[PDB]
């Protein structure tokens, strides 16, 4: 499930009128057509911050897995964090991070290598050349891993009690017995087939890793979100070479070629073109942000339901009789293991 | 209301020069000057304005007296002390109620402060004043309104400014105004109680952008910061041969309009002062480019079409026109990028007994598509006869522009030469005599490479520019790399400094200390820029060394890094959160604490069972 | 806003210019105000859709939390939900989720099953909990120990398949009578 | 005439509306009246 | 409950310029103001 | 980059007339002509 997209703080003044005082004066005749856009983008960014907060920060206390890992034979190493890795992420979380490529990381401070680009400057440097910047998420992709690890450790050592009040420890076989009792099968089934259930769970956990490894793109939703962001931004930046019915598309060329009282016509034409393009971008971004809000509210209620307890709702927490679910952090999204 | 205005104001906490008296320097006048003085009863009469203050330029005099004021706009000579000695070409005298008002409560302690501001926007001399009893023991810090008295259109040039003294048997507070955005608080009764600048302090700027007087705790994005370029680099081609405009304007046999001579201008430096020299100009209509800005653009090719033509057809010659010449002899393109030249010539196209050498066409089968020559002698068909000859219904195509020294201006032998340009992305060869400056790398500079204007930072590169390659771009069609015309090397182009400034403050009801976060920029870049004074932001927040922080979201200025962890109050970005915490109070930056660090006691056979319970009522809105 | 016109007052411009040339400024003003009104309408539509989502969530929250007990976690506030009470607010609603939150806990002991005579005993509902010396059966979300009798536990097993089984005696009220 | 829908042409300021007496605190140099959204609210009578 | 609605794939090029080459050339000066519309409608249809 | 251009080009898998020599007919010129010869 997607949880958030890239945050942008587009600057209308620089985007429309690159360091041109006459163009700024002309744009001042259009009223607050810029403050509205800045407010909308800022609201989107703060909203998406709130979105990640809602999705992950569901636990006030950070739990940590016990030093020894023997949960009745159930093998949890694949989703438990790996101390060896510098990023402290589980192997299943690492594949998701590796299979998603972000066009703009944002937390790069890429200024300083536009001169150092040597080859043709890339899309990010081009965007920086024309007034479009990307803010980084408030919650780092490392601290989100801490949140996910806490949520995972709380649901395999304390059952669902840590989702309601104080965390009460319970052995994993008994937690499994109670999850079984929640669907109408008695605990004697588990206490008699414990080894077989452990082997089935281990095999399933092992085989989903290869299913994600070998598939072309099972993360297609997150990749689609990223692609839509990058493609909308590129379509925006491609409008700076459209004449919009003017003599030329370069404001610096036009201001240096025509004296102001005639040039103002071409400047006004460019103003109307770029303002309308920016309005289109802002409207589409608002619609996409609302869609992402809907999807990530679904993700938040799914977390609180399937992770913090057992859900009686059919098919909501995966197909079949739901037992548990383990959250996994993904770039700009979350992955559930029903 | 909290109305926001942009106008010439006195900057807050600015420099004001305090004088004394016991000779009268002429203070400069520019964008208006703020004046103030404290005196017991009266020592200042008036003020003198103008340029050069002599009997050669119109001047001003605002001299006050006991009962009226003696405003006039005149051309005095001098007094050097009865304040003028010349009123020769002088009009516009004005007299009204006196500006000075002095009141005392039976004591001389009430030294009322007299405040004055003058400005000369589009003439229309504005004079504003206010007398406040705040006594003048110190230049006070309370807010004082200033109301206008008179507003009159001098419409003259003012650069210098002087003052007048009185006789007898600590003043002169002078300030200078600048164009600033101001946010003024209007009382319920209409007076102005409070006002704050928008280009003085970061908190002031946030207060401007969220127009109000109370700024709630949080982080506010206000504007962007840009490193304005230091130097201007112009690198024109390596050619110095003057263009042959001399040889096309020195001609003696400018061909007729029916056969427009077309010369090509290439591989030369184009200075248009030589165009101005050989031209008693009559028609300088330029369409593609402004004639004044003609030396600063590089043209891929220049065409010079010249032909003698009558007076009215000069007005005919223009993009998108009509007439026997604009239809059958010479049609300019509708999207013409160029300029036209026309100066009268009655000395070379005229002689006694007359001259009829010139020619023009009124008879053509169809209109002339633009920039086509149609030299041909075919008799225009009339009716349905294949007639080939002269006479009725058999008309010769081209007629004569006979020119003699005695016609009207509408019939005089005007000389017309047009200049055709092409300003697109191509390796330019012809442009102005602008000198080629040096090249400096790794610094924000305005480059003018071969007519390609822009700004940014340039350095060495490792492209593989093919011999014909000149420019560089990206999938977004933006100029990336340029080849040096006089060095033949490759340089990349950088954004100037584009970023965005966000101010981190607690509530103003708590404190006024603020933090500045420059988004997505290495903090060494802003530090050197702020040291060289090349940052567009004019609010310079202090940097004491202990308040610097390279965040993943940019760099933070004004708060120090504490290594502790708390639930934070102001999100910043990338796991860093700022807060107003006691030391005795300051703003601190720390990484988020996700919560209490707790460890469960999971075991093979241990269970924790709650022996008690509580009832809690939460709220959802 | 002038929108690139001579002035931003229709009543001024109409009385200042004769129509054949006034129409240029008027058309500029329509071009500006129409686009501003379109922007306002678009933002209002988006906000209306968001408020639709919020109001549908509020409606299902009312019908679930108020008109019954919800088994969904955290949906009716944090903790084991008991009830809720609606309150009217200007352009909104305020819910008062009354929830049961557990409290002080004690670490005792647990065994998956109890082997009395070659048969594993499992609690019908609850946990086999041991004080430390005498095994007991109690509920889940509260501590209420009881003597292990044959009615609190159902028996099915062979005392050889369950892991962690702890020996104890189970009682029956039938042999005594 | 007050308290009636009339077209006013106050000193060249065209418009329509209903006018009446007020308790403003117009300073001597004040001539017009506006509001927070920059719309002409109150006018000073040239002849009274 | 509504489950879906009609899928449309309007064509900007002719909808604006009915088989007119000059109009198509002039529309080409407005940039990718059409590819965006086609992509949005196609995404709507696929989502439907 | 995958830059897309609209300009006069030789069509792919188009008709190309191969001549010989051992007289030199004039070929029409229109919108440009692609010429090639091996020697
Ligand atoms: C839990 O599951 C792990 C799977 O990642 C097991 O790790 C394996 O270790 C072997 C070497 O012993 C590797 O060859 C293999 O690729 C895998 O990484 C782990 O042993 C297992 N632990 C238990 C207790 O079942
Ligand atoms: C606006 O102007 C009103 C009229 O002068 C003021 O009302 C007056 O208030 C004084 C006391 O200051 C009374 O004595 C007098 O009778 C009258 O009511 C009003 O205060 C003023 N408001 C301001 C200055 O904020
Ligand atoms: C469970 O917790 C209750 C409070 O949450 C306890 O009630 C308290 O009773 C004392 C008197 O003993 C009061 O002083 C106090 O205000 C509160 O009402 C209750 O006793 C406790 N019970 C157990 C078994 O722990
Ligand atoms: C095991 O649970 C017993 C509850 O029945 C506790 O025994 C109690 O002990 C008292 C005397 O100490 C008896 O009078 C009472 O009838 C009861 O049997 C016992 O404390 C508990 N053991 C532990 C270790 O908690
Ligand atoms: C529970 O009690 C059983 C008898 O009441 C024990 O069975 C015994 O097991 C031993 C070997 O451990 C045998 O030698 C003996 O014959 C008898 O079968 C059982 O072990 C015991 N379990 C525990 C965990 O104490
Ligand atoms: C005013 O002038 C003094 C003396 O030059 C200087 O120290 C001070 O900084 C000036 N004020 C400001 C605000 O710069
Ligand atoms: C002051 O100036 C006025 C201007 O007309 C003049 O009439 C008057 O005589 C002057 N002197 C005094 C004392 O008022
Ligand atoms: C006023 O100006 C005119 C301008 O030519 C000049 O001729 C005349 O002498 C001037 N009058 C004076 C100086 O009294
Ligand atoms: C005003 O005087 C200044 C100072 O000489 C000069 O630079 C400027 O061009 C003058 N302007 C006019 C309009 O006379
Ligand atoms: C033409 O050339 C002669 C040669 O010296 C020169 O004197 C004259 O000024 C030139 N005239 C023009 C219009 O170039
Ligand atoms: C430019 O001209 C100078 C002067 O002749 C010469 O020394 C230099 O080599 C030239 N450079 C190029 C690139 O032509
Ligand atoms: C930005 O970060 C630091 C601080 O300036 C320095 O290494 C250099 O300027 C930049 N480094 C990189 C990797 O961009
Ligand atoms: C305290 O902060 C400093 C940097 O200010 C850091 O280097 C150090 O590791 C911190 N100490 C602890 C115990 O976190
Ligand atoms: C639980 O039992 C396993 C195997 O019997 C053992 O490895 C582990 O250390 C035990 N843990 C505790 C807490 O008793
Ligand atoms: C029970 O004892 C263990 C042993 O240290 C402890 O870790 C756990 O917190 C205790 N549980 C309680 C006091 O509820
Ligand atoms: C307007 O003029 C008339 C006629 O002199 C006079 O009676 C009236 O007082 C004047 N009103 C004002 C406000 O000047
Ligand atoms: C090239 O010419 C041949 C012979 O006329 C013809 O068969 C072939 O189809 C032509 N190529 C194409 C692409 O039409």
Residue numbers in the entry:
A (entry chain C): 727 to 1064
B (entry chain A): 47 to 68, 80 to 138, 158 to 210, 212 to 246, 263 to 482, 484 to 677, 689 to 726
C (entry chain A): 968 to 1144
D (entry chain B): 534 to 581
E (entry chain B): 727 to 774
F (entry chain C): 47 to 68, 80 to 96
Sentences from the paper on this structure:
The dense glycan shield consisting of 22–23 N-glycosylation sequons per protomer is an essential feature of SARS-CoV-2 S architecture. The glycans have been shown to play intrinsic and extrinsic roles in protein folding, modulating conformational activation and immune evasion. The transition to the ‘up’ state exposures of RBD for the binding to hACE2 is also a prerequisite for S-mediated viral fusion, directly correlating with infectivity. Here, we dissected the role of N354-linked glycosylation, acquired by BA.2.86 sub-lineages, as a RBD conformational control element in attenuating viral infectivity.
To further verify the role of N354 glycosylation in modulating RBD up/down disposition, four additional modified constructs, BA.2.86-T356K, predicted to remove glycosylation at N354, XBB.1.5-K356T and BA.2.75-K356T, predicted to acquire N354 glycan, together with BA.2.86-ins483V as a control, were characterized, and their structural features were compared with the ancestral strain. Thus, we performed all assays under the same condition by using three representative variants (BA.2.86, BA.2.75, and XBB.1.5) with strict controls (loss and gain of N354 glycan). We observed that N354 glycosylation dramatically increased the proportion of the ‘closed’ form from 19% to 79% in BA.2.86, 50% to 75% in BA.2.75, and 45% to 90% in XBB.1.5, making the ‘closed’ form the dominant population. As expected, acquisition of N354 glycosylation generated by the K356T mutation in BA.2 and XBB.1.5 decreased its infectivity, and loss of N354 glycosylation raised by the reverse mutation T356K in BA.2.86 increased its infectivity. Moreover, the binding affinities of the BA.2.86 S-trimers with or without the N354 glycosylation for hACE2 yielded similar results, despite N354 glycosylation promoting the S-trimer ‘RBD-down’ state. Interestingly, the loss of N354 glycosylation through T356K mutation decreased cleavage efficiency and the reversion of S621P moderately increased S cleavage, indicative of BA.2.86 S-trimers being more likely in a postfusion conformation under furin enriched microenvironments. Not surprisingly, either the loss of the N354 glycan or substitution R681P/H in BA.2.86 substantially reduced the cell–cell fusion activity; on the contrary acquisition of the N354 glycan or the mutation H681R based on XBB.1.5 contributed to increased fusion activity. Notably, the N354 glycosylation decreased BA.2.86 immunogenicity by ∼40% in comparison with BA.2.86-T356K, rendering BA.2.86 a relatively lower immunogenicity among SARS-CoV-2 variants.
